[PDB]
Design a protein around this ligand. Sequence first.
Ligand SMILES: CCCCCCCCCCCCCCCCCC(=O)OC[C@H](COP(=O)([O-])OCC(O)COP(=O)([O-])OC[C@@H](COC(=O)CCCCCCCCCCCCCCCCC)OC(=O)CCCCCCCCCCCCCCCCC)OC(=O)CCCCCCCCCCCCCCCCC
Ligand SMILES: CCCCCCCCCCCCCCCCC[C@@H](O)O[C@H](CO[C@H](O)CCCCCCCCCCCCCCC)COP(=O)(O)OCC[N+](C)(C)C
Ligand SMILES: CCCCCCCC/C=C\CCCCCCCC(=O)O[C@H](COC(=O)CCCCCCC/C=C/CCCCCCCC)COP(=O)(O)OCCN
Ligand SMILES: CCCCCCCCCCCC(=O)SCCNC(=O)CCNC(=O)[C@H](O)C(C)(C)COP(=O)(O)O
Lengths: 70, 128, 178, 274, 459, 63, 88, 124, 175, 84, 104
Amino acid sequence: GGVHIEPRYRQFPQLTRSQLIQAEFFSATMWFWILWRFWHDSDAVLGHFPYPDPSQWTDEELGILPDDED
Amino acid sequence: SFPKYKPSRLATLPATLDPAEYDISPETRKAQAERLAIRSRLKREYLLQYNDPNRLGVIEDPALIRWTYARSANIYPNFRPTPKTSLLGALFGIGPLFFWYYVFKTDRDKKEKLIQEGKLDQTFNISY
Amino acid sequence: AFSAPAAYLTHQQKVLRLYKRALRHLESWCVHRDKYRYFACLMRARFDEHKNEKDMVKATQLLRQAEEEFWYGQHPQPYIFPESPGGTSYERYECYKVPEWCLDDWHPSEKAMYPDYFAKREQWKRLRRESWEREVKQLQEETPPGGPRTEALPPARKEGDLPPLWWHIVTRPRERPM
Amino acid sequence: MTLCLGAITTLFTALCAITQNDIKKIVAFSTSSQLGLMMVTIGINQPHLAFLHICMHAFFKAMLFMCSGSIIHSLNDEQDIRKMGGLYKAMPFTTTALIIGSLALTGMPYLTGFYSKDLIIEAVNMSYTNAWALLMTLIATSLTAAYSTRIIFFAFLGKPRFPPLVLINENNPLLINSIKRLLIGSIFAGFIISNNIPPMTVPNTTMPLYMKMTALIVTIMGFMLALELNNTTYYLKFKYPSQTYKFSNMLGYYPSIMHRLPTYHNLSMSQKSA
Amino acid sequence: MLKIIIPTTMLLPMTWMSKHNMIWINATVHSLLISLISLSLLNQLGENSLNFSLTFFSDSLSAPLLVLTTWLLPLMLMASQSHLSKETTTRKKLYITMLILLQLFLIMTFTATELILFYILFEATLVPTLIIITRWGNQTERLNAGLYFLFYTLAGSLPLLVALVYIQNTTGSLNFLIIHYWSHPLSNSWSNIFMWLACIMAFMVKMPLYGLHLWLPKAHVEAPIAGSMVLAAVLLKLGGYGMMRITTILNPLTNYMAYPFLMLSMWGMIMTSSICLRQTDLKSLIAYSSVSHMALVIVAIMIQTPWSFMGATALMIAHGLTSSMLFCLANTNYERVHSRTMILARGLQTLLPLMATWWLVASLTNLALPPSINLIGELFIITASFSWSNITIILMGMNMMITALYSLYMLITTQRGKYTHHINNIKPSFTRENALMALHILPLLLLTLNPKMILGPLY
Amino acid sequence: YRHSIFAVTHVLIPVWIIHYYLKYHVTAKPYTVVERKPRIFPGDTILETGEVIPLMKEFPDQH
Amino acid sequence: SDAPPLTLEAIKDRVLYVLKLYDKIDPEKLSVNSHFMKDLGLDSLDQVEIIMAMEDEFGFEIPDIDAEKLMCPQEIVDYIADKKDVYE
Amino acid sequence: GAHLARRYLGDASKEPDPLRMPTFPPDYGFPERKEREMVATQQEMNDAQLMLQQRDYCAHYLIQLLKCKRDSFPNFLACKHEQHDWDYCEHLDYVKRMKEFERERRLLQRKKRREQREAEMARG
Amino acid sequence: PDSWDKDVYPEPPRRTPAPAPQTSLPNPVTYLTKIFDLLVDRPVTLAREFIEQQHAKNRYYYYHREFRRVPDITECEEKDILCMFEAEMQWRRDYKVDQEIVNIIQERLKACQQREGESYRQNCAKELEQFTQVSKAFQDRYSDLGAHYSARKCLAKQKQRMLAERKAAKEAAAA
Amino acid sequence: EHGHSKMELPDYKQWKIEGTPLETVQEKLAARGLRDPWGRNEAWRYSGGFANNVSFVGALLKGFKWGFAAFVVAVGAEYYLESQ
Amino acid sequence: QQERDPWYDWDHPDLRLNWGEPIHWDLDMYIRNRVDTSPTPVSWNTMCKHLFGFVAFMLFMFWVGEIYPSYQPVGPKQYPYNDLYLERGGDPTKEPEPVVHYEI
Ligand SMILES: CCCCCCCCCCCCCCCCCC(=O)OC[C@H](COP(=O)([O-])OCC(O)COP(=O)([O-])OC[C@@H](COC(=O)CCCCCCCCCCCCCCCCC)OC(=O)CCCCCCCCCCCCCCCCC)OC(=O)CCCCCCCCCCCCCCCCC
Ligand SMILES: CCCCCCCCCCCCCCCCC[C@@H](O)O[C@H](CO[C@H](O)CCCCCCCCCCCCCCC)COP(=O)(O)OCC[N+](C)(C)C
Ligand SMILES: CCCCCCCC/C=C\CCCCCCCC(=O)O[C@H](COC(=O)CCCCCCC/C=C/CCCCCCCC)COP(=O)(O)OCCN
Ligand SMILES: CCCCCCCCCCCC(=O)SCCNC(=O)CCNC(=O)[C@H](O)C(C)(C)COP(=O)(O)O
């Protein structure tokens, strides 16, 4: 169902423009998709909710007494 | 110098690592000539029988018949009860039966004791 | 393959065989062409340094350490041509090879198609029928007494003769029948 | 048991893959490593994540085998990567599809492999499991990047190494359309399927920054390391292989021993005793 | 029941007064008609039985075996048509007479409401088969084979006769219905142990039980094709039917007397299967596969649970059909090559493709591919054995694996590869052989649609 | 034309046969087709009965 | 496949093309029937390298036993033609 | 991770064991002890039939999200706010779990410090 | 459907939520169901109606066989064969009906788990309780009888169970 | 319909080692006193369309320019459509 | 029989046998579909040592990881209604002791 292309014997083979434009198009849409998804949905890679530092918590909300009462 | 290759039963020695092929004597050359001669005689016989337009059917191979007869019908007349044969036969023919009998009898005994005591939990076990 | 083997391989043949194997395994190790060319010339130069050696004992002591060195560095996964006894398509077409004699069992309705082919086939059959009777006597008279010493056959020496045992070499199925 | 089996499977198979020369063998070991990852996911009690990974692996692995077959047929039934050279330009459609499939397989963000593999790694990192199984999964990720690099580098980048009679041809609508459908799938099916299914598990909303980015880190490290090691093959230096290379190339020696020691000892008995 | 017996008897005058060139046609047509008539026995009850009269009765264990027995004879006639072409008309009529006598004895055996009548016919089946084996057999070992096949059998069943009469002097009857209704437990005594042994050993020797199977490779290899068909398909099942019938009066001794045999079977099914891996003969390979399957049936019958019995009935029917098919295929090869060696003729899928398809189907059925009735029987027996003791699965599992191996081994050695170069007398398969294969295989795949018809009286 | 006849004799006829077999033979027996019970959320209304499910308890909404 | 049906002329052209790119052999002197050892003064190692070059050219390899006795371009062409079943 | 290194290379009794957490009474710290509240009742959280593991304190947001996903079916990107709310609730729950771990660690620290102080006072 | 009893095979009222769509977008499901209805349900309904009329043109009846009650094995002489035969047939019929009762209960249980969905453990507790009871009773009645089961063996099992229960009750009372 | 088009081979004088890694190989060989006799046989691997290579990173970014251009255009359109 | 000469002209090219030559006792054991004894690049004992060592090392490390797991600095997951007592198994008539979650 293709076209006639002869062998080349030690030269670069013949290429149709259609396959070149198709490969370029599909790579282009892949990269466009990656960039678009990164722009609109960035939290999927870098996270969205900050990770709290357990050492930064004060002792008051931690339910701890200064080692004398209980 | 490089590490040596050690041949085994299931990984034999290469031909190119054989010391025998480098110790060449006229007796060995005569032996090799004779082996080629007998091989070529057999090949000539087979090819003469093989290219015959008259021939129909199968070229009977005496070697194949010898192999099948030796493997099948030649065993018992050459059998002799020796310590090796007796011990290997007794082992390989009696040991497995008693091993499996012990295993199954023990398992069924433990299961039966559990059932008699009542603690096995056979709930929903209808089809046996 | 085609050629009949000999009783033994000479030292010259063994050295040549080691050379071919070593070059192939270098090519497998050196994937790129220029690197392989460099190391193949190096191997050739290292190979012909003992070219002019005369005594047999040291020459046979060589090719032995050489073979151990080959076996140490032999590339566990060398390159094999696809059709070679190791390649990915070694016997891929052996299920499509059908003997010629099967055509003798064709129904006459089948043989009705391709009438020219079967006419030619019958001519070939007659040719074989005459040639075999000549061939048996030629091989009988030409062979030395006590049996053949090699599995190599003589050609046809007369005018109308054909090479002895030619039917099953000429009528191979094909390399790729279908 | 399931987790440990999956971890050892993925590590061992990827390790064997990184050093193979047959393209189909490389893809087969990739498939086995991915199945090991699926079983690892099953072990950590995430069945729906494993099902999603099945669904995406279908797409991109199938299209990878499509591309391998295209190359093999176009180079006249030659399967060794030693004899295929510059195919980036000689066959552009095949080259572009393969690059996309390798990027998807290695968990490139927002691709069909991202929405499964990224979650696999996140779930394995933030669960109560073995340290060893975790380490094996991470090393398997790196080795995945490594053998994808190997395929691309050895089949598409260098100088041609095939016989002189060039017969390269993609120009057949059947091959092109069949490959392009799975290409569209392996680009967009991840987003579509992930956004269409209902929530079937509790997400990992908060993660340490280094733990959120671990999959990308290991993939990039594997890429860089495999590229650097492949770039040394152009050098005019030749050395004999080590023991580790021989172990990995001959498949941990498992097919040798296990296909000679048991079978023999069985068949021998079957004739000598029985 | 006489509606099947009388036509089987009229088969003899029909054969003996037929024209010289019309015996095969008449015999085949009327055997097919008798099979169609016997098909009506399949309509069974969940209640007692089809008690026709004081002499004969039918049940859902006897009905499938009777149908298989009636269906097998046309196949044996078709198979035997070929290698008897150069034989005088009188001797061909005698051959057909032997086959008809064997069918009549089997039919009267499977109904047999009384145990001494069952013994008499079960022993009458020995004579026609012995004549067939030792008369129309090709090799010189056939005589020896016949001797084995005879004496083993009698050595097992001569004690049984004594046991039977002893029972009738204590119980007062050997009618199976009265035996079932008035059954009593067997006390744990040495006399009762030996009575149990006498009752069981006759059917164990004909199963065959492992270690008592030596007559079977000889008799199966050395017999003509119809002989092999009937030995593999039906005659092995006489032991199964008899052991199913006679274990009603052996309880509860069977609970602990079954141990020596169970091991012998459970280990036996392994050893014989292993033997098939290294076999240079096709008929010997098929015979050893038969031994393995019948060992599994033995285990089923000795476990004595409803699932065990259903599995055993299904497996007996399925194994009969499959073993008959395999023997017929191997004979088709032998008639062309005359060698009976597995490695000599190779790569036959290239020369005989449809016969290769038949080979594949037979091998797959032997290999127990679901949902074939082979797998139904094997799976039920495996489940029952698992309930008996959970460790049995190990042995069971091993056997399954091994079976597949040798089955596919037999398929790859003969059908695949490169053809033998010097064999040029492999003619295309005749319509008779393809019809024989189709008639073997289509009933199996039809029976997988209605399994309850072969699952026995405990369904 | 070819696609029309293909869709008629390869899709329409099997779906007709299967739908008839399911609607008038398989359904006639109990428990042959068991469908998963559809989800009910606070705020929907049922066709068969018409009662409305009461809303939830107004959780404190912020971010 | 789509493999062109190579002919005798194609085989001869490719064999001579490969031989002319061997600088050890002068293109003017080489002929189709020119012997290797005597007419061109080549070594045995040169012959084995020539055989490997033809193998890499044609995509199939020749057994050492057959390769060692191929001493003219004409008989190399004949060997390849017989191996690949070439009509014309 | 640091806790893994601290527990496996340092003092095992210094840090909590996640299998036996918590080892201290809830009222040990402060006597207020505010209760955890839910919005979803038993019956509606059964009728939504989420999952047994999805049946936690964040269930109301999950139910709202499922209602969205069901209503705005053809466009699968309409209800994103409820996804964010459910994610926020799960984030707060995880931060609460981390607070619980930190409290248990500090309570163990203070208990062991008190034990060492009592040992020193008894010795001297 | 009236082809089966609703009390033997119970089913909850099957309440389904009304469909309210927040999004204007036309969903493809409604249109696909409309085309499926038009192209499949209407012709199938017409064919079924034609078949039903052709059936109503020829109506005939079949009946469920009734079996009388017979004395069971507990009231048969030792060697009287006719009473044993009748009692054994009756016991076999009872055994078959018992199997079908267990089948019915299992069917309810199997259907409920699927019907309930993700809340099956809490919801199917009632069904599970029923199957537990029925399976326990069936196990007491017919377990470990063997391939050659009969009414005499079931009676012997019941007698041994009753003896064990009476001994246990006497021991507990006299403890 | 097959490929019968009478394909004609190039001229063998066309292939030269110059400008290729084979020239470097020949230099390193001559520094030792050797020569590569087959250098002109493989020259065709560096002559035609095979002369220009692509790097690994260059291969991965096969369609980055057009993808980035389309992404910028789409972002501009979306920004201008939302701010209305 | 996998290690015979593949380039010789055997009468049985697939089996690699010649007509009339003596046949090995265990031919059906070595038929190129079964156990082969062809030499390998690495010695048999070295292969055994490496395979066994790798497997044993992996087993030991899996056990070590079982002893030293990996987790997160978090408390156990909290479920509302007495740890979902009614929805997990049930038993609504037993009045199970109440568990109240801590708010921090
Ligand atoms: C937590 C902190 C986070 C930071 C962590 C650190 C960051 C990164 C640091 C990097 C660390 C190492 C990474 C480089 C790997 C080495 C690559 C290399 O140089 O290979 C060349 C070199 C030999 O090359 P060659 O012989 O010339 O090959 C000939 C040609 O090149 C033939 O070549 P070719 O063209 O045919 O094909 C080339 C192929 C062929 O090359 C090979 O032969 C490959 C073989 C080595 C690679 C395997 C590495 C994976 C290790 C996993 C093993 C698990 C444990 C197994 C236990 C075994 C027990 C005996 O190589 C490749 O394609 C690429 C190789 C892999 C690179 C890409 C992936 C590496 C990164 C992933 C690892 C670390 C990151 C993990 C991420 C998670 C964070 C923790 O290989 C080695 O020498 C091996 C080096 C290390 C191996 C250690 C194992 C030895 C075991 C001996 C016994 C020990 C005692 C046991 C006691 C038990 C008693 C019972
Ligand atoms: C050849 C290939 C196989 C073919 C078939 C072989 C299978 C035949 C096996 C026969 C079944 C078992 C035979 C006897 C079983 C009785 C149980 C007995 O063996 O065990 C002990 C019996 O103790 C001793 O075994 C007594 C007998 C010792 C003498 C027998 C010879 C032992 C080995 C002979 C094997 C030869 C078999 C082949 C013969 C040709 C139990 O101790 P005890 O509580 O006291 O007796 C219980 C029985 N009571 C209550 C009725 C009294
Ligand atoms: C292929 C080889 C198979 C050979 C057959 C092996 C089985 C042998 C079975 C035993 C043979 C005799 C059976 C007895 C007949 C049944 C009747 C019966 O049991 O009555 C008993 C009698 O039982 C006997 O007398 C049996 C005695 C045995 C004598 C013959 C020994 C033959 C060899 C036996 C050892 C081998 C058994 C196992 C062999 C396995 C196969 C190799 C009770 O007699 P009473 O005195 O009237 O009542 C007692 C109260 N007063
Ligand atoms: C990765 C693979 C590693 C391989 C490692 C192996 C290293 C190879 C080193 C081998 C060293 C030697 O040369 S071992 C030297 C062996 N001894 C001789 O060569 C003495 C006489 N030589 C001959 O006869 C030859 O055949 C010859 C004349 C050349 C041809 O003859 P022709 O006129 O008929 O062509």
